[PDB]
Design a protein around this ligand. Sequence first.
Ligand SMILES: [Mg+2]
Ligand SMILES: [Mg+2]
Ligand SMILES: [Mg+2]
Length: 332
Amino acid sequence: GTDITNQLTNVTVGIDSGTTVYPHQAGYVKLNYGFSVPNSAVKGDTFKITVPKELNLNGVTSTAKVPPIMAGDQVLANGVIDSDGNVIYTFTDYVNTKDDVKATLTMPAYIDPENVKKTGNVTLATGIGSTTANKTVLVDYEKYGKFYNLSIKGTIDQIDKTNNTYRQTIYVNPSGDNVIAPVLTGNLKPNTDSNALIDQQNTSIKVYKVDNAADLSESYFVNPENFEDVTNSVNITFPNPNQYKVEFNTPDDQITTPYIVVVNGHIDPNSKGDLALRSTLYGYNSNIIWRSMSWDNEVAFNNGSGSGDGIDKPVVPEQPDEPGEIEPIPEK
Ligand SMILES: [Mg+2]
Ligand SMILES: [Mg+2]
Ligand SMILES: [Mg+2]
């Protein structure tokens, strides 16, 4: 179990991405590593990759998998994230019989909103031993949309091209206003050829209640101690084609704090369209006027380009036709 980090040779480390990264358009940076393994290495030896706290490796959730390093079709090393957030790779028995091994590794890295608190420049740094790479990038977060007492901010946190999935978060009432009888709907962005498939089989939804608006930062981060899972209290349905509906039904029939809706859905691999979505928050004000406010999220399901050029903005939809009723397709 010798830490041979300093014994690796021909080491290269790099950070690749555009000058601007868009976390809510499934944007991420690519961390790359290259190195030659000394022949003295044996099964059990390890090496450490220094990871900056500003990034979340391989995914936006804690369950993201650390990819193994390969040698031909054999696993060269298996990695794990330690208590410091760094990655520890442990060599397999491949090094016991193979000499002159040269390896590479690329891991997508997402912006960690807990450590990047608002739109601005951030200096990213990663490395192996004394071989480090640095890059300053501009991280962009859009302010939430607000129409009367209805505020909303939708996102697309990441997509998985091979498994045809995507993860989206919708921040309901980030402004902390008073909303009576609120309802959230998620549709395909209208008049577009969206590739999303929204239904009971393809869409998993969880809802969390935030203690207060003050607990939601400009990068939309909420400390785990300030939100709790209330999926049991809302009514989730899919009343129309490719549309989900979340009725909050709180005890007072009013919400005064933000709510986080996490959507894990799927894409139609045979669709030639992009992942285009429109989220709409409905609600009454004190004067019982039923209104609706939307937010559009769109990203190309190409994977080729990191991100950028997508869509992440507010949209005022045609207001509801009937009070208390949602629209099958929120246009305008
Ligand atoms: Mg060896
Ligand atoms: Mg982090
Ligand atoms: Mg706040």
